[PDB]
Symmetry: D2
Subunit: 28 residues, 4 copies
Amino acid sequence: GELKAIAQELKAIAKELKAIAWEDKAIA
Amino acid sequence: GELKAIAQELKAIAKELKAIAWEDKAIA
Amino acid sequence: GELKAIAQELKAIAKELKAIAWED
Amino acid sequence: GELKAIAQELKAIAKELKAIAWED
Ligand SMILES: [N+]
Ligand SMILES: [N+]
Ligand SMILES: [N+]
Ligand SMILES: [N+]
């Protein structure tokens, strides 16, 4: 369903934001 | 950090959307 | 950059949630 | 209702992400 699929997208965005945050630390 | 905290918020929103989607099914 | 593109995705999702709120 | 309030949260988060993109 649409809400289930939007929930999966939000969880994926959360993992993508943590990856960015981690890249950013490494480099600084 | 701020991105880590926003990631947690997005994961929490995903669980809240699935709960809404489930409530909605039960009732329909 | 990337964060702006993610922000745009979140805005698009917001619009989708408002639409779901008002369907039958 | 609730979904609208979540949509508003997502928009607020979008603004926070754009701000992070432009800090040092
Ligand atoms: N994404
Ligand atoms: N929330
Ligand atoms: N979406
Ligand atoms: N936030």
